[PDB]
Ligand binder design. Structure first.
Ligand SMILES: Cc1occc1C(=O)Nc1ccncc1
Length: 291
């Protein structure tokens, strides 16, 4: 899977909100482009002159994420964040020249991402009460990953002492994205655990935080909620469910070729962090069948 790279695998089965620190600093921003940010402005102008209803939005930028020594007390992860925008993404990660920007950032800064917007996405491995994960089918008419399978998620918008409010907005955003797209009541959802961070190499290395969320409804009840919104209550064109039993071997299935990169990152991290038992009971052959 060359289109996805793991930046972070969390310990302990995944980290809760209370164990994560953020540092939000202009030192973590994109570097101005070599020949100036006028190249971003030009792309944006061209786009607005064809689609004048489009609007910019701020986004969080991922600079880096450092894990504490495993087994330690205190905060377990430090997220280094800056600010970016949808406009800066369209002018850098989405540009035809994005690979040239990656080479120049290696030359100039020793950092392939230094000239890239790299907005932080969020995604969920969302489990039902009857042990299925939730999948969504993408419209064949959108610009990004048309017609491919996704998981719930999105790209959160801004508004350890500004840090803790930023970590709160990241965790809140993955629940809000599940309520808005799957049409689930907020009180049917567990507090999220962070599983890790995955990069999309087809989008010049932009990263997504991947979370585990448990729902108290069965697959049948989740389907009813999604569908009862009607076609205008969701951006996706369909919902479907895979038993957690069968997610273990998903990369060997014909489904794997239809998964978008950020959904592949969610399923690899689910399998490594929530799957893959370490203990004698769950690791016994009748409960963890070989192969
Ligand atoms: C990544 C991180 O975020 C906040 C603190 C740390 C960290 O590394 N903590 C630590 C270092 C050394 N011994 C024990 C714990």
């Amino acid at each position: 899977d060359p289109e996805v790279t793991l930046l972070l695998q969390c310990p302990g089965g995944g980290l809760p909100q209370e164990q994560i620190q953020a540092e939000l600093s202009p030192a973590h921003d994109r570097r101005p482009l070599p020949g100036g940010d006028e190249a971003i402005t030009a792309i944006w102008e061209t786009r607005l002159k064809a689609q004048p209803w489009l609007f910019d939005a701020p986004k969080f930028r991922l600079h880096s994420a450092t894990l504490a020594p495993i087994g330690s007390r205190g905060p377990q992860l430090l997220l280094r964040l800056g600010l970016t925008s949808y406009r800066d993404f369209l002018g850098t990660n989405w540009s035809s020249s994005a690979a040239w920007l990656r080479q120049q950032g290696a030359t100039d800064w020793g950092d392939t991402q230094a000239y890239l917007a790299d907005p932080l996405g969020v995604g969920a491995a969302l489990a039902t009460a009857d042990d299925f994960l939730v999948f969504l089918r993408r419209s064949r008419q959108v610009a990004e990953a048309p017609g491919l399978v996704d998981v719930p998620g999105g790209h959160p918008e801004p508004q350890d002492l500004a840090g803790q409010l930023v970590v709160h907005e990241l965790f809140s955003s993955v629940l809000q994205e599940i309520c808005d797209e799957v049409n689930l009541p907020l009180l049917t959802l567990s507090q999220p655990l962070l599983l890790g961070i995955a990069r999309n190499e087809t989008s010049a290395g932009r990263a997504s935080a991947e979370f585990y969320v448990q729902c108290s409804l069965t697959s049948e009840q989740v389907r009813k909620h999604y569908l009862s919104g009607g076609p205008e209550a969701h951006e996706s064109t369909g919902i479907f469910f895979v038993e957690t039993q069968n997610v273990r071997r998903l990369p060997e299935t014909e489904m794997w070729a239809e998964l978008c990169p950020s959904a592949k990152g969610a399923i690899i991290l689910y399998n490594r962090v929530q799957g893959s038992p370490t203990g004698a009971a769950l690791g016994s052959p009748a409960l963890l069948p070989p192969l």
